[PDB]
Design a binder for this molecule. Structure first.
Ligand SMILES: C[C@]12OC[C@H](O)[C@H]1O[B-](O)(O)O2
Ligand SMILES: C[C@]12OC[C@H](O)[C@H]1O[B-](O)(O)O2
Ligand SMILES: [Ca+2]
Ligand SMILES: [Mg+2]
Ligand SMILES: [Mg+2]
Lengths: 337, 342
């Protein structure tokens, strides 16, 4: 719908019914009580994670939390090698190849990632798990990685777009704060822009990329409003960006402007309950960490493993009752607390 | 007695009889049936909880579980905010993310106190705010705060439990027994838990410490530390682990290495520990009557809402448990310890 060379999550599942069967099976295995590993391993399995560090978004740390906890509950012996990638400056600390890991948990936002993934796929025996993407790549139809896991960007963005198009009318002005340049921005961003422009006839005033930090969100917001102060809402593509943007609106005295979150972590939820963030799409966070454990389990039991898993979203607005937020938290952080 | 600047738990109550009286009272109210809130409140009280997450030890989870249920049974409206703490660096992310929840303006704040990093924050909370402060998992008041003590120190006394362990090891093992120590991460816990055991066992029983290592407070770290230790000193008769996760990592390490000769303990007696005890992989432990400290916090908060004096300190009770204890004994102990957390 927005990028060429990918399967839609649902498109994938519709094209390959077996994959729907597996992904459903995994969904159910992710919901039900832990069923421990049925095949003792001779030694620990070496699992390596590379994740973006020091984000205000708690997605990753909660993902590892819920992952490790489900691993433990499943009675799987492992060694976890975690890498904290400082907020951008190298990436050649993808030296976790030297680790000779059994499972590699990584991301795919840029091309700098693509090249490396193709390296991991065409060279090693290491099973690759791609977090925060759920739309498989067509070029890899012959050898797809072990699993794509996350909360589908297109869907979560679609739901937001829908809510905005429901609240605001035709010819509503808005600006967009992207993530850093890459896959996330393209999907999270252009999905919203296309829906809202073509279905609801809004008028995009401007759009800017950020450095994926709160500071950058703040700066970018300010610049955007300096150039186009007359918008009805800003659409942010991520937690930190949106939370910087919130400070920008606060400093500029612009309460007229609506702003969204994206993901519904703890920070966003506090902001929403404060009224600083107006709407968000909230991912049932722990499901994906728990899904990775289960996938790994089946693999060790020589059961077939789905290629894709996507977790559920819930729209959350500042008009929600604290009861609702509490229940969603109890659902979403049932492992990471 | 292994650190300076701290009041002993018994010493403190020996110093202040009214303080003992209050603590005895709290114990009584803890064991007895719920006597629900007298003076009701206009609003639901805001409580901010800062706990470490992601561990095999079920102490915190069960503490919360029991706390909320005793709160319910006392009928007190409350909102309960769990601040996610990432043991992942850095000090200045933690610090700000701790400062985040003081603009939350909570009635009560539940915290830990392990690092010097925590000290500065606690001191800030105490020096500059109205928020009533409950320090979980510490039972020895800081002498430098005699001007203005926290609302409550609550937990199970590290020195007492370590002594009990030290005594059992002292009873079983002869003089000149070689042993190694796995600490928690650096801090107050490691200091008391580790050095109380080391001092008692070295000085009273003439044991010999072969080595000692800090961990990162995780099971994997306990495993790595066990391996490293036994790599450098394979000749030890037992390892003394300073926490559940560390202990359970060490257990897997001793499994992987094939050292069934080396004895090893837990520290806390949670579910994982007990299951390991009964499996025979863990040898002895000091089990705490878990839910008492959760029920205590709940009471202290009640008494406060009724404008009654609350004791500065409360320490829950301990029971030694070995793999030679019958399932019945284990079941009685579980029955007591987990009466609320199930
Ligand atoms: C996972 C994530 O996607 C990009 C960034 O890593 C996170 O921020 B976010 O919370 O907006 O979702
Ligand atoms: C509460 C606790 O003390 C330190 C650590 O936080 C927990 O693990 B434990 O089970 O050893 O008890
Ligand atoms: Ca010492
Ligand atoms: Mg575009
Ligand atoms: Mg506003």
């Amino acid at each position: 719908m927005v990028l060429n060379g990918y399967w839609g999550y649902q498109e994938f599942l519709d094209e390959f019914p077996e994959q729907r069967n597996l992904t459903n099976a995994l969904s159910e295995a992710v919901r039900a009580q832990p069923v421990p590993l049925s095949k003792p391993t001779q030694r620990p399995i070496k699992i390596s994670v590379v994740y973006p560090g020091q984000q205000v978004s708690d997605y990753w740390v909660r993902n590892i939390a819920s992952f490790e906890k489900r691993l433990y509950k499943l009675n799987i012996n492992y060694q976890l090698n975690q890498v904290f990638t400082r907020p951008n400056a190298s990436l050649s600390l993808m030296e976790a190849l030297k680790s000779k890991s059994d499972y590699l948990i990584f991301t795919l936002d840029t091309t700098r990632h693509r090249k490396f993934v193709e390296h991991v796929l065409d060279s090693t025996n290491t099973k690759l798990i791609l977090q925060n993407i759920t739309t498989p790549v067509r070029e890899w139809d012959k050898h797809q990685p072990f699993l794509y896991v996350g909360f589908d960007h297109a869907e979560g963005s679609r739901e937001l777009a829908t809510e905005f198009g429901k609240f605001f009318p035709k010819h509503t002005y808005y600006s967009v704060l992207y993530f850093s340049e890459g896959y996330i921005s393209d999907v999270r961003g252009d999905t919203f822009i296309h829906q809202v422009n073509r279905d609801n006839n809004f008028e995009l005033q401007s759009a800017y990329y950020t450095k994926a930090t709160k500071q950058s969100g703040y700066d970018a917001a300010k610049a955007s409003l300096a150039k186009h102060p007359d918008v009805d809402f800003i659409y942010a593509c991520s937690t930190d960006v949106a939370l910087g943007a919130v400070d920008a609106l606060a400093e500029l005295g612009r309460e007229d402007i609506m702003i969204n979150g994206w993901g519904g972590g703890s920070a966003e939820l506090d902001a929403i309950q404060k009224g600083d963030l107006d709407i968000t799409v909230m991912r049932m966070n722990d499901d994906t960490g728990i899904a990775m454990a289960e996938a790994i389990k089946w693999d060790l039991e020589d059961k077939p493993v789905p290629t894709v898993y996507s977790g559920d979203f819930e729209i959350v607005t500042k008009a929600d009752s604290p009861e609702r937020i509490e229940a969603l938290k109890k659902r979403a952080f049932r492992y990471s607390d």
